[PDB]
């Protein structure tokens, strides 16, 4: 039964995504903050998509790493094609949705990953930054408050909802995020920021004595 | 595979 085959594929995707650590994305006052529980120190799951566009995904590391590389190369190609400002996270969001639905359909082994897209207005621009959550079957979600990735997203989404404070400060948003994801140590956690205050490249990682001091 |  193709119905049962697709059900089995979807449940396999659900199992693979659930057996992944929690990643949290939230838009605070100074931009958008990303925190990922990362026991590995070499592996990264939060990268920059473009100058004001950041990357977040959960699932199989190789899968979403390849997806990140594809999205980044396409974004670079598009920006070179027209302009640095002509690229919007919505564009690559649709591109990711297209390719994810594509691989889910054609490929026998699906990519059991859950990806999010966050972008910020350009420097000197006022705009509520936009969030895009894309599922394995090309299911895009424009979450207006906070994005939860991997594992049992229900408790973290609940704790984040109960304590979501719009326009929260860097440190306050960090505290809210860590309290929610707990519901740990300085290590094993990966954190980075899309800073609207940045002139061109909004992305910035947070690590070392910095991350220690901010928590 | 690896979900880390």
């Amino acid at each position: 039964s193709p119905e049962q085959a697709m059900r089995e594929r979807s449940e396999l995707a659900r199992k693979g995504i659930a057996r992944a650590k929690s990643v949290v994305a939230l838009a605070y006052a100074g931009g958008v903050l990303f925190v990922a529980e990362n026991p590995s120190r070499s592996l990264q799951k939060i990268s920059e998509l473009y100058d004001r566009v950041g990357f977040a995904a959960a699932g199989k590391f190789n899968e979403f790493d390849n997806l990140r590389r594809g999205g980044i190369q396409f974004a670079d190609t598009r920006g070179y094609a027209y302009d640095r400002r002509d690229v919007t996270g919505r564009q690559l969001a649709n591109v990711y949705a297209q390719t994810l639905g594509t691989i889910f359909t054609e490929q026998a082994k699906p990519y059991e990953v859950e990806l999010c897209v966050a972008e910020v207005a350009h420097y000197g621009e006022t705009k509520r930054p936009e969030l895009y959550r894309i599922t394995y079957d090309g299911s895009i979600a424009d979450e207006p408050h906070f994005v939860v990735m991997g594992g049992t997203t229900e408790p973290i989404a609940n704790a984040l909802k109960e304590s979501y404070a719009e326009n929260a400060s860097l440190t306050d948003a960090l505290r809210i995020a860590v309290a929610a994801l707990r519901a740990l140590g300085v290590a094993s956690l990966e954190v980075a920021v899309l800073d609207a205050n940045r002139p061109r490249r909004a992305f910035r990682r947070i690590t070392g004595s910095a991350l220690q001091a901010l928590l | 595979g690896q979900y880390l």
């Binding site: 094609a81 027209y82 302009d83 002509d86 919007t88 | -």
Partner: protein, 222 residues
């Protein structure tokens, strides 16, 4: 041929002549070389008229295509980049005589200052672009004479109408200096075409006002 642009307080105006020739023989007398490229950009191309026409068509084509596909107009610099891409791609045709050099003006709708949202960008043979800072630019055979006169006349630029008058004056001067450029025809009632871009967009100038300006300038020269 010779085609001119200039920024005025509150927007930009674009104008060009109507004469097409083969060598020193006259082929066309009413050639429309200025085209409203979008709501806020228009362009004119100097060189081979056929190549210019197809470039205008094609470039407006990609503009509309990208607009529909992405649901959003391209930024000014993005349009500059695309136009530069296509003109550079035409280098092989240009070297064999299929030359057509465009000139793009447009109202940068995203400019912080509305009063300085007009943008004039000129293009070289290699396709390299430059945003003009003198507030005026021209292309075509007599572009030297037009720019030279406009150097003097830019002091008198104050609004749309002043820009209209000075631009048509420069076109008349270039015609007075260039055989390949056709001046206003009081006999045939044919006059250079002009288009005005502002915060409200790109609009064609009615020929009546062009004729008024031409008659006034000729009488002044009389």
């Amino acid at each position: 041929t010779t085609i001119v642009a200039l920024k005025y307080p509150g927007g930009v105006v674009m104008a060009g002549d109507r004469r097409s020739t083969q060598g020193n023989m006259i082929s066309g007398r009413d050639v429309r070389k200025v085209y409203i490229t979008d709501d806020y950009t228009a362009t004119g191309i100097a060189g081979t008229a056929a190549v210019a026409v197809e470039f205008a068509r094609l470039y407006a084509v990609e503009l509309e295509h990208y607009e529909k596909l992405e649901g959003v107009p391209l930024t000014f610099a993005g349009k500059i980049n695309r136009l530069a891409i296509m003109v550079r791609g035409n280098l092989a045709a240009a070297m064999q005589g299929l030359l057509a050099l465009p000139l793009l003006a447009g109202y940068d709708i995203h400019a912080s200052d509305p009063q300085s949202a007009g943008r004039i960008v000129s293009f070289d043979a290699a396709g390299g672009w430059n945003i003009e800072e003198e507030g005026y630019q021209a292309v075509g055979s007599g572009s030297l004479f037009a720019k030279s006169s406009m150097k003097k006349l830019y002091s008198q630029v104050t609004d749309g109408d002043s820009g209209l008058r000075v631009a048509v004056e420069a076109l008349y001067d270039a015609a007075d200096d260039d055989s390949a450029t056709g001046g206003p025809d009081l006999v045939r009632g044919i006059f250079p075409t002009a288009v005005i871009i502002d915060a409200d967009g790109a609009v064609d100038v009615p020929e009546s006002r062009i004729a008024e300006l031409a008659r006034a300038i000729i009488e002044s020269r009389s």
